[PDB]
């Protein structure tokens, strides 16, 4: 369930597709917060026209190593 | 019933030795010796660590404190249903029988035992420490 959640977050609330075209400048992000009580500030400018929390789990690099290029596969 | 006498020439259980045995206290202060009778050869656990084999018949062992002897007594009584007994030996050679003191185990009442350290009152009836103050030394109200 946890792994499926990681793949779902990388497929619907991430910037993996944009990060593929520029992995040296775009920060990996796979978590977005809802705009409530002023917490939207946590959705930082990670690059690629995306706003979210910079993840450090390394799922982007693992997916790139496996040959995943689209959100449909995730 | 009569008080038994320690037999120093009694075979000991088969044990290869350990580092949890006797120390200088046995040679300078005192030590304890436990003896028991076994119906057959059986492997038991030593209170100081390890597994020993008690032989058929008399068995003698030495320990540094009385708690080790009573722990072995409890193990032999509850598991193998034996009746062990121990003594306190001094470096001069004096032997003092310890348990069972009157030949009967203390858990069961036996005639001839005189009660000691018994207060004919309850805890709530104890006096305050102020009435015990300025005594010979630190005394609790329960001691009177």
């Amino acid at each position: 369930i946890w792994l499926s959640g990681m793949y779902f977050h990388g497929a619907r609330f991430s910037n993996y597709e944009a990060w593929l075209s520029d992995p040296t400048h775009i920060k990996p992000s796979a978590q977005v917060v809802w705009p409530i009580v002023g917490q939207e500030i946590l959705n930082g400018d990670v690059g690629g026209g995306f706003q979210g929390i910079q993840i450090t789990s390394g799922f982007f690099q693992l997916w790139r190593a496996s040959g995943i290029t689209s959100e449909l596969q995730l | 019933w009569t008080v038994p006498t320690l037999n120093p020439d009694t075979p000991s259980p088969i044990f290869g030795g350990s580092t949890g045995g006797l120390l200088r206290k046995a040679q300078t202060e005192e030590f304890y010796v436990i003896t028991w009778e076994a119906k057959k050869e059986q492997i038991f656990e030593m209170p100081t660590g390890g597994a020993a084999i008690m032989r058929q018949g008399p068995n003698l062992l030495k320990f540094g404190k009385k708690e080790q002897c009573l722990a072995l007594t409890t193990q032999l009584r509850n598991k193998f249903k034996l009746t062990p007994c121990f003594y306190r030996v001094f470096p001069d050679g004096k032997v003092q029988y310890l348990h069972p003191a009157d030949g009967v185990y203390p858990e069961k009442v036996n005639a001839g035992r005189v009660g000691a350290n018994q207060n004919m009152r309850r805890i709530g009836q104890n006096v305050n420490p102020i009435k015990v103050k300025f005594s010979g030394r630190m005394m609790s109200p329960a001691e009177i």
Binding site: - | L23, G64, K65, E67, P106, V109, A116, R122, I123
Partner: protein
């Protein structure tokens, strides 16, 4: 040595004697309860103060009390 005291609220259940790990307590005849027995402490010089007897006592409040007193080789449970 520690001070072990028995009180008259004892019911003679012999649970404190069975729980003593150094043979300090025993049972003596008595007439103040149904069991006709009472706990006793005739070997307090060997008491270490573990208070297992107090843990095994079912009366409220306890019928056996252990007050930590002077410390010696036996009371400290030293094998050296």
């Amino acid at each position: 040595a520690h001070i072990v005291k028995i009180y008259d609220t004892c019911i003679g259940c012999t649970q404190c004697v069975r729980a003593c790990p150094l043979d300090v307590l025993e049972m003596v005849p008595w007439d103040g309860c149904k069991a006709s027995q009472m706990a006793s402490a005739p070997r307090t010089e060997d008491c270490v103060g573990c208070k297992r007897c107090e843990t095994a006592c079912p009366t409220d409040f306890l019928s056996v009390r252990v007050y930590l007193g002077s410390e010696s080789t036996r009371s400290m449970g030293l094998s050296y």
